[PDB]
Amino acid sequence: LHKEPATLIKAIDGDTVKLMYKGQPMTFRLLLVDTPEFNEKYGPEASAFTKKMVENAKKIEVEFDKGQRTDKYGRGLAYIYADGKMVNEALVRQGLAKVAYVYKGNNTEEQLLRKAEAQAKKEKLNIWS
Numbered sequence: 001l002h003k004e005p006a007t008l009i010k011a012i013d014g015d016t017v018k019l020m021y022k023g024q025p026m027t028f029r030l031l032l033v034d035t036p037e038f039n040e041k042y043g044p045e046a047s048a049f050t051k052k053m054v055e056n057a058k059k060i061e062v063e064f065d066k067g068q069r070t071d072k073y074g075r076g077l078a079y080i081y082a083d084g085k086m087v088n089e090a091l092v093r094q095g096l097a098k099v100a101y102v103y104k105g106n107n108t109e110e111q112l113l114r115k116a117e118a119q120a121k122k123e124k125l126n127i128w129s
């Protein structure tokens with residue numbers, strides 16, 4: 001897969017973010033993860049974790065997988081990198097997202113992310129506490 005440039009417009013929640021991509025504002029949905037909604041337990045902590053990660057980044061990059069690049073709501077589906085660190089993985093590693101929504105074809109980083117989740121569980125972090 002290939003990393004492409006983008007700029008932060010606005011943090012939304014734990015697993016969605018508004019970015020400018022090829023000069024167009026787009027809501028991005030993080031592949032392969034599910035954060036709780038803001039109105040659920042660990043929702044606010046997830047939102048804050050993603051927000052800090054993208055807001056502190058000097059460089060945001062997106063990486064589409066081999067499959068569907070936009071979902072039924074028009075959100076871009078991507079792995080999003082903040083100064084070279086994947087937000088998707090970082091969520092999971094901290095137990096603020098579960099590996100989820102794993103659809104054939106858009107599953108390149110599945111193994112990396114399940115590995116993170118297994119560690120987060122072993123540590124009983126957040127959701128796993």
Ligand SMILES: Cc1cn([C@H]2C[C@H](OP(=O)(O)O)[C@@H](COP(=O)(O)O)O2)c(=O)[nH]c1=O
Pocket residue numbers: 029030031032033034071072077101103106
């Ligand atoms: C992450 C992801 C979500 N979705 C859709 C499936 C779910 O449909 P429904 O809205 O019908 O449940 C929804 C969950 O996204 P949220 O977790 O952001 O709600 O987003 C995809 O189609 N592909 C994906 O890769």
Ligand SMILES: [Ca+2]
Pocket residue numbers: 015034035036037
């Ligand atoms: Ca969610």
